[PDB]
């Protein structure tokens, strides 16, 4: 029985720049448990029908989890632009899979956790699909070398969401789980109960 519960119901979630990836393999996947009672639950699939998942079989499945702003839940989709799509988490234009998200204001908006969720704001190039940049090197904005310290035209690349419960929904923290269904010319190891 695949460990979706651990993934979706983790106590903490990763920052978007250091998004987590969990291989799901050699297991039976009850996709009917993919739900919760958080306020703005979304479940969006691309090139695949979620009503067929439990009659489908895959080589492997990956669950990518992270937290972003509500504003940005739209950037987690094929062919999107913006800070998150460009510098933090990128799906390919050809993406097949599902993006599951929900409002997590009740957990991720405490002051004590103000630095727990970060995002990359400056970067030399855009990330290719499914790349992860967890580097913390000063970003040279211009001509002069930075010599390891932040200053004029030299920025620390990561900024903090600093979530607060009093903010508008669009600024509140949302937990996101991205499911990629790998399909190789190899034996299936992840099947729904019906298959």
């Amino acid at each position, epitope marked *: 029985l695949c460990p979706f519960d651990e993934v979706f119901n983790a106590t903490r979630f990763a920052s978007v720049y250091a998004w987590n990836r969990k291989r799901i393999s050699n297991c039976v996947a009850d996709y009917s448990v993919l739900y919760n009672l958080a306020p703005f639950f979304t479940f969006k699939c691309y090139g695949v029908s979620p009503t067929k998942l439990n009659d489908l079989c895959f080589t492997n499945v990956y669950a990518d989890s992270f937290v972003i702003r509500g504003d940005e839940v739209r950037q987690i989709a094929p062919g999107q632009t913006g800070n998150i799509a460009d510098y933090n988490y990128k799906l390919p234009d050809d993406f097949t899979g599902c993006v599951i998200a929900w409002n997590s204001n009740k957990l991720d908006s405490k002051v004590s956790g103000n*630095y727990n969720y970060l995002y990359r704001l400056f970067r030399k190039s855009n990330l290719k699909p499914f790349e992860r940049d*967890i580097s*913390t090197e000063i970003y040279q904005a211009g001509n002069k070398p930075c010599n390891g310290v932040a200053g004029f035209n030299c920025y620390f690349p990561l900024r903090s969401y600093s979530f607060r419960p009093t903010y508008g929904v669009g600024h509140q923290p949302y937990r996101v789980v991205v499911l990629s269904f790998e399909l190789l010319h190899a034996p299936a190891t992840v099947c729904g109960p019906k298959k």
Partner: antibody
Amino acid sequence: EVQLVESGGGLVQPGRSLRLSCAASGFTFDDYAMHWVRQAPGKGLEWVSGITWNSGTIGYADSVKGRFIISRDNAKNSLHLQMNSLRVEDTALYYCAKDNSDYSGYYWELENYGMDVWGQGTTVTVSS
Amino acid sequence: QSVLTQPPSVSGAPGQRVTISCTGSSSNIGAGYDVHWYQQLPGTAPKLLIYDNNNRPSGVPDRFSGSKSGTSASLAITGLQAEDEADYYCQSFDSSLSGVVFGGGTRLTVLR
């Protein structure tokens, strides 16, 4: 056998930066929370930060919040700590440490962190 | 100052029973988080000694024991041996700070 080897320490002047790293060996890295714990010469253990099995930052000692950044890399079995705007009182031996429990943890449960294996510390000195 | 409070010093003679107290708050120990104990020698990395308030890591002799009640926890050493001379640290979690919290540490001297 579990092995945790810190690196990245050294001497640094106030305001500068430093990135520590910890190579994890002998266990399933991504089943466990990882922790940074520091110890100033002749003082007590102070938890710096820690990160869950799914790369979820737990928190920061209020003395380093905003200046330090924890991160893990589950493909290279590695733990990291970016230290920015270093202050003199950041001088300490910095331990990597594996959490005792492989329990996944869920949001309606009380977290339980304890470190059953410790590395030896990479020394960090902040001095003008 | 640490959020968990620990006597700087305790001492006893060989064979006696010594205890070390660790008091917390509504935020951490009274909030229900487990308490763990560590043992360190000068020049040595720490070593887990008690976990989940009363469980002994394999190889920690049964003459160490631990207890937790309300806002407080305690480590008990009953057959004190010269070997037991070390620093001991209690540890828990504080939901107010969302972080692990160590006690200030206790110097335990086995009086020669």
